[PDB]
Design a protein around this ligand. Sequence first.
Ligand SMILES: Nc1ncnc2c1ncn2[C@@H]1O[C@H](CSCC[C@H](N)C(=O)O)[C@@H](O)[C@H]1O
Ligand SMILES: CN1Cc2cccc3c2N(CCC3)C1=N
Length: 266
Amino acid sequence: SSGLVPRGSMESGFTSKDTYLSHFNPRDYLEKYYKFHSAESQILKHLLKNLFKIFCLDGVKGDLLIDIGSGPTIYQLLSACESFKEIVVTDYSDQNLQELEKWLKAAPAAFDWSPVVTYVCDLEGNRVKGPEKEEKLRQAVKQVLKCDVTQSQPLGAVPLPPADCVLSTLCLDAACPDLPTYCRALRNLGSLLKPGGFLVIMDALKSSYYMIGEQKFSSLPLGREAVEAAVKEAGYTIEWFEVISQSYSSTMANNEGLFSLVARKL
Ligand SMILES: Nc1ncnc2c1ncn2[C@@H]1O[C@H](CSCC[C@H](N)C(=O)O)[C@@H](O)[C@H]1O
Ligand SMILES: CN1Cc2cccc3c2N(CCC3)C1=N
């Protein structure tokens, strides 16, 4: 369908799961949004300050954190590895999981997160340097699993203890074709959480597509209200909800800002 409509969406209107296994390139994605005063860096700086505030300034701590739809990225776990003993990274895409495993073993061919790590280190008061912080995160990531938000058991039949937190960054908008699927995916992740467990979500507002170069992928256009309502219906109580008006470059997405939320599983 070239560029009229997102890839894998001609039939259903939304990018199909197998499009993420076939046309999602981890290296390309990382080079597009995570190299670094672009729109992409300003959003990543906001994302990092929010994760720093949630995990380090606020009481978002425990033993196990599960990251849902991690992709090939690790920026979302930097501040979290300070409050959680264990972290499980998950994604639907095996090529994404392989990119994480390169980084986990500090393979020379893995993506360089050094600028991002230095930035989280400066935010955190410079108690440690970049290489020390990287090793603490690497040591905290205990599992790298296959994930599928649309399944009642998202991690398949992998026995895991109940988690104290479930973090999901820029995944749910890309994975859920409508509000009922979005609500059901929030219920599915709740099955991984202890009662009173934390749900941390950060995603785009009113975006119908996002790009990896010239490959167009679907996004669920959500407003502030629809996210609030779907989170509440899924069995959660919102602790806090933030909305930034900052959007990605016009050549990469049509988002009208982003949101951050901390909710509690009822
Ligand atoms: N049904 C599904 N279940 C779980 N993850 C899914 C999914 N469909 C798509 N995804 C994943 O959702 C991600 C969207 S990109 C988000 C990457 C990363 N967390 C970040 O913040 O940059 C992709 O890595 C894709 O593989
Ligand atoms: C890094 N980006 C930019 C982006 C921009 C607008 C919408 C969406 C995204 N997503 C996935 C979720 C949907 C990403 N992963």
